[PDB]
Amino acid sequence: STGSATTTPIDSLDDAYITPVQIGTPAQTLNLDFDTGSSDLWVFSSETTASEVDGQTIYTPSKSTTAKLLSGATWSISYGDGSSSSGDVYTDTVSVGGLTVTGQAVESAKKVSSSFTEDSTIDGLLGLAFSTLNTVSPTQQKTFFDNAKASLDSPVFTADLGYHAPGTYNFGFIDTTAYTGSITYTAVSTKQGFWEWTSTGYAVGSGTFKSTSIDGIADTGTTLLYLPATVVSAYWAQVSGAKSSSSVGGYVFPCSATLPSFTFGVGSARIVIPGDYIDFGPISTGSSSCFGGIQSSAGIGINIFGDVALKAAFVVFNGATTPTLGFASK
The missing domain is CATH 2.40.70.10 (Acid Proteases)
Known part of the structure; x- marks a missing residue:
């Protein structure tokens, strides 16, 4: 079926x-x-x-x-x-x-x-x-x-x-018509009950790719992309006027900005999140401060590849005896 x-x-x-x-x-x-x-x-x-x-x-x-x-x-x-x-x-x-x-x-x-x-x-x-x-x-x-x-x-x-x-x-x-190129599969740990996997790194905009292991979960029920503070700081440093606001609860940026893309690694493959996907709009109606879609996972205890990341890909949740995750561009 x-x-x-x-x-x-x-x-x-x-x-x-x-x-x-x-x-x-x-x-x-x-x-x-x-x-x-x-x-x-x-x-x-x-x-x-x-x-x-x-x-x-x-x-x-x-x-x-x-x-x-x-x-x-x-x-x-x-x-x-x-x-x-x-x-x-x-x-x-x-x-x-x-x-x-x-x-x-x-x-x-x-x-x-x-x-x-x-x-x-x-x-x-x-x-x-x-x-x-x-x-x-x-x-x-x-x-x-x-x-x-x-x-x-x-x-x-x-x-x-x-x-x-x-x-x-x-x-x-x-559905082989729903994505472009090939699907790259990557190992899953079920030890915490999640679709937990390890990204191979990231890039900000047109910048060079940083190879680094980022363990996190594929979570369709989380809106945003939550990553280590180092990674998130490197991203927002490329947006003039962006800053972390304790009062608002995360990184905010001027609504006049054009956001860079963010790339994450899946094995040797790369998924590119367009900058527009990272815009969550005014913090309150009429504000010129906009809420960012990439936020720090520090104090969550886990990195979360939420909807911001997942919506940039076609994602396979493979529940075979040894589960895996697949990502393709689309």
């Missing part, structure tokens, strides 16, 4: 991407944030504290003839950005882009933190990291991808995120 679904930016900055997902019988379609940095499929629901729901579409398990309470199971997750959610668990039929999994754990939120409530466009998350990170207790649950894997034509999914435009998540096949 295979599946193919379009993923759409939630706003004009590509802060996140939503993908329609069918849950239950008859189908209830919710728009979920596909997150290769976590491993829980959770949704706003009929059980979510009413004051914490503001415009989201909810899953109502009592209206699904295939929903079953997973008795005694609870979940609770805290994300890197300080957001969180928790609740109980149903199993139900879940379909993405024509690919169907029966008996998928659907984690129903009883509580969500303010950042979730405030984002009316995201109805929940669909985790695509390794199932070892799943938070369901006392019986850990599998991700949608792990459950689908054995049925898929090939045990892979691909992320093809757009810059200020829709893109595609495919399951079970590699």
Whole structure:
């Protein structure tokens, strides 16, 4: 089997991407944030504290003839950005882009933190990291991808995120029309439960490539590119007037600037992030200070190849017995 679904930016900055997902019988379609940095499929629901729901579409398990309470199971997750959610668990039929999994754990939120409530466009998350990170207790649950894997034509999914435009998540096949040149594959460590890999270096604009190992995670659920302070300083030093602002929470730059590109290495291959992808616009409406898309990972504890990086590539998440990651230009 295979599946193919379009993923759409939630706003004009590509802060996140939503993908329609069918849950239950008859189908209830919710728009979920596909997150290769976590491993829980959770949704706003009929059980979510009413004051914490503001415009989201909810899953109502009592209206699904295939929903079953997973008795005694609870979940609770805290994300890197300080957001969180928790609740109980149903199993139900879940379909993405024509690919169907029966008996998928659907984690129903009883509580969500303010950042979730405030984002009316995201109805929940669909985790695509390794199932070892799943938070369901006392019986850990599998991700949608792990459950689908054995049925898929090939045990892979691909992320093809757009810059200020829709893109595609495919399951079970590699669309050879979706990228240019060849796909370069690189080793993955699953020791922390992430799609963790080592970039071979970077360049800023038309500058020379610096060969250096950068260990990080491919994370579709993180907006920005978070890299070591040395690398990030070297980038922003090429933008007149750019500076790190503790009050704003990162590097800012004059909105009048033209940003240089940023290149990262994948083996001997190179992925080029155009400068425009690094512009996250005014820090507040009408401001002439703009927020940068490359930020320091110092004090995160891990480097994160988030959407800024991933959207510049066609990315293969290869879930074979020895997982790997592939990157192609597009």
